[PDB]
Design a protein around this nucleic acid. Structure first.
Lengths: 158, 610
DNA sequence: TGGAGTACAAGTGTGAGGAAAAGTAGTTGGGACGAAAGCAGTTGAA
């Protein structure tokens, strides 16, 4: 919080969470037998079947940071690369990155054969990443309320 | 309904940028993080009194010694009256004597009469259950927990013409099984060390356990801290140790383990918030505001905050703040080892939209550590909030309000003898110095009477003459004794260095005495490169060394001068080590010791390498 | 106007504690370019 809420010559905290998720990337299994001294899982380590909290804070705070910069392609290219096949929160973020492109591009700037179908691609990415998010374990989304927003992107498109 | 949940758990932790967004594209801060947004919130104490009256471990079974909440008695039902505020605290010798209204700040009332009901057992917990708003009324009965029995008090028709609360009591049930019970709550429903039972309260004080009971007994939890609370009016109970929370509904036979807190944390405290949905839990390492669920009233594990302090003795108290748009839940954790509070601000809206704002900390009184802290309900953006503390190792209770906008008797019990014949016999010495000082303020005053006289120029010509030949007497022994092969005093003359009346002259005179010894067996240590150790700055001189103390001791002394003169006249004679020989004398004592040690300590003794 | 009991301190042996950076204790990661022809002695059964 100190780098982001300093704002003077700041890295805004996002290059430091990038530092955390580079050198503490460890897909190793949690051996669950040794007594643990000076480490604890739920806030500072990142084993297999547990995404690290600095990893998902790097995903939330770079989606929100990219929204406020209006580069979403570059986060959507990164989230593509790690298919965390053990959790639903990364897939909700990956579904929500495409919802933001499907939100931004659904203004149409007229009152176009390529402007149409690209939004349909992002709408179909949301409906298929939210489905695989909901098939996983516990991450309860307002899955009705998001469908009201995807249809609203298409009614503006028609 | 925000999005980032586990279902099982739900986090808004310590400044780690909470884990949700709806992406509400509504141009109205298009995000609904659990983190909220506002300005700051600084808190300011309003310190005021309300009332009054081996060590490497601490007892978990002792809980509190007081209570403070609005009570509505039996005669207020039929009549118009609604709600009277009381405070009942232990007193006495071993904590055994349990004993009101609000003008603008809560103060003890006019007739201010302690209703000292008497017991024969140590008080170890004093608490009400609280009230309900579904019942519409307030409870007028309170239960306390002691070592020897369990007691119930019943408050009947609090009086207004005399400010006197007559109290009634139930039968104090002693122990059939010899096991010290821990916690009461009602919403004799009690928790013994390892098992619980439901107790029945009667209507007739003019003269127990029901046929259903349960146990949570763990062979590998070691502590003696348990806790019980009724949950969400279903006659579900919640039972605690330091390792798990068990949910038990005695309506059916239905027992579920919900929290299992063995691995990295422990359950520390559990306050049931007057909100019949939301209830706040203090674990070690996290603060949990786990509410109730509308589908099944089991546990809505809500937005919890990762608290930082690690400790073994943390409590919590919570106060609701009811605004018309939303409900706040400020949570105050406090420890028995140090003097601090730690707070966090929660908010709640209609759609179970629990949020979080930030944290702050303030301090307490320096004498003791807090042991019981309770918020006054206050009958129910500039947040105001008020409460009472109680500190351990002091029997005083003070009252505090928070708005948005060191003496120890052990040093006293080391002096002050009761020996009246030895009183002035000690006290003569403080009157003995009444004589000895006034001579010294007057004799150097006779030197104040003279100012750079030739009669005292003679007196200092006589000074160095018995410093020259005395040196010439103290030199001529060391040359003949020089072959010792195995410094001095400069207080040999006891005739002078008492009545010399110039600092810049004697500084020059010793420099006049320094220049005289060009010969061997005599060196010195210079004062001006060393006199700075008292002022802790660059002091290159002896004459400006007085000039620092000259401006320094002006106010705090009668006439302020010759006392300041005499100490400067003392320190150069206090470092009276000016009797070093030449360089030859320690160098020839270097070479003698390495010869005496073996050839193994030759290579061990080498200074000046790199 | 000597003795009987007795707490305050000067003074003397027993082991028990304290710490660190070296090494070693169990899991998991990881190491190993070929589907050619007429023909002949033996050899099929007639």
């Amino acid at each position: 919080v100190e780098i982001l809420d300093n704002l003077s010559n700041s890295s805004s905290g996002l290059d430091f969470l990038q530092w955390m998720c580079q050198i503490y990337s460890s897909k190793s299994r949690f051996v669950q037998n040794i007594n643990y001294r000076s480490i604890v899982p739920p806030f500072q380590t990142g084993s297999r079947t547990h995404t690290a909290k600095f990893a998902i804070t790097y995903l939330w705070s770079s989606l929100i940071n990219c929204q406020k910069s209006m580069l979403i392609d570059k986060i959507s290219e990164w989230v593509l690369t790690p298919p965390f096949m053990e959790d639903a929160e990364v897939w909700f973020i990956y579904a929500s990155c495409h919802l933001l492109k499907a939100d931004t591009l659904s203004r149409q700037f007229v009152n176009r054969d390529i402007k149409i179908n690209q939004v349909i691609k992002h709408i179909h990415y949301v409906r298929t990443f939210l489905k695989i998010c909901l098939d996983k374990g516990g991450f309860a989304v307002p899955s009705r309320l998001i469908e009201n927003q995807l249809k609203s992107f298409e009614s503006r498109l028609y | 309904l925000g999005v980032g949940v586990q279902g099982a758990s739900l986090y808004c932790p310590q400044e780690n940028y909470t884990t949700k967004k709806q992406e509400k594209p509504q141009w109205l801060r298009p995000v609904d993080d659990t983190l909220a947004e506002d300005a700051l919130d600084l808190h300011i104490v309003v310190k005021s009194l309300l009332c009054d009256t081996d060590a490497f471990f601490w007892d978990p079974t002792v809980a509190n010694r007081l209570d403070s909440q609005y009570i509505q008695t039996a005669s207020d039902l039929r009549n118009y009256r609604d709600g009277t505020e009381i405070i009942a605290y232990a007193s006495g010798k071993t904590g055994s004597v349990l004993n009101l209204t609000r003008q603008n700040t809560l103060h003890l009332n006019r007739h201010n009469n302690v209703t000292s009901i008497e017991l024969h057992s140590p008080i170890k917990s004093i608490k009400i259950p609280g009230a309900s708003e579904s019942i519409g009324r307030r409870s007028n009965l309170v239960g306390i927990i002691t070592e020897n029995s369990f007691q119930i008090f019943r408050i009947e028709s609090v009086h207004s013409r005399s400010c006197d609360v007559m109290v009634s009591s139930s039968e104090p049930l002693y122990f059939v099984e010899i096991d010290d019970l821990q916690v009461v709550d009602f919403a004799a429903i009690i928790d013994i060390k390892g098992n619980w039972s439901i107790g029945r309260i009667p209507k007739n004080f003019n003269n127990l356990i029901d046929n259903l009971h349960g146990t949570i007994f763990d062979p590998e939890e070691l502590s003696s801290w348990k806790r019980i609370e009724w949950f969400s009016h279903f006659q579900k109970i919640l039972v605690f140790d330091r390792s798990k929370m068990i949910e038990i509904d005695f309506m059916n036979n239905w027992q579920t383990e919900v929290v299992q807190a063995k691995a990295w944390s422990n359950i520390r405290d559990y306050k049931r918030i007057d909100d019949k949905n939301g209830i706040l839990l203090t674990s070690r390492e996290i603060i949990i505001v786990g509410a109730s669920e509308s589908n099944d009233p089991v546990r809505r594990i809500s937005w919890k905050h990762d608290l930082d302090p690690d400790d073994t003795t943390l409590r919590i108290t919570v106060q609701k703040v009811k605004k018309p748009d939303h409900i706040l839940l400020v949570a105050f954790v406090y420890s028995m080892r140090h003097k601090r509070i730690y707070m966090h601000v929660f908010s709640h809206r209609k759609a179970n939209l629990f949020q979080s704002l930030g944290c702050s900390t303030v301090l307490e009184i320096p004498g003791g550590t807090p042991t019981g802290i309770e918020t006054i309900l206050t009958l129910d953006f500039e947040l105001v909030v008020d409460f009472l503390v109680k500190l351990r190792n002091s029997s005083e209770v003070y009252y505090y309000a928070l708005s948005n906008t060191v003496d120890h008797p052990e040093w006293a019990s080391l002096f002050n003898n009761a020996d009246e014949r030895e009183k002035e016999s000690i006290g003569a010495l403080v009157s003995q110095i009444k004589l000895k000082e006034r001579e010294r303020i007057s004799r150097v005053q006779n030197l104040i009477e003279h100012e750079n006289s030739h009669d005292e120029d003679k007196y200092l010509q006589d000074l160095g003459y018995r410093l020259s030949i005395a040196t010439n007497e103290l030199l001529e022994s060391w040359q003949k004794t020089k072959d010792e092969s195995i410094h001095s005093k400069l207080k040999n003359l006891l005739e002078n260095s008492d009545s010399f009346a110039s600092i810049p002259e004697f500084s020059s005179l010793l420099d006049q005495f320094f220049q005289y010894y060009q010969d061997q067996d005599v060196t010195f240590i210079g004062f001006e490169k060393l006199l700075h150790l008292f002022l802790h700055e660059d002091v290159p001189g002896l004459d400006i060394f007085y000039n620092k103390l000259l401006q320094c001791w002006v106010l705090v002394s009668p006439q302020a001068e010759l006392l300041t003169k005499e100490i400067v006249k003392d320190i150069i004679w206090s470092l009276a080590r000016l009797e070093k020989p030449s360089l030859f004398e320690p160098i020839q004592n270097e070479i003698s010791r390495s010869l005496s040690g073996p050839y193994q300590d030759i290579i061990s003794s080498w200074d000046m390498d790199d």
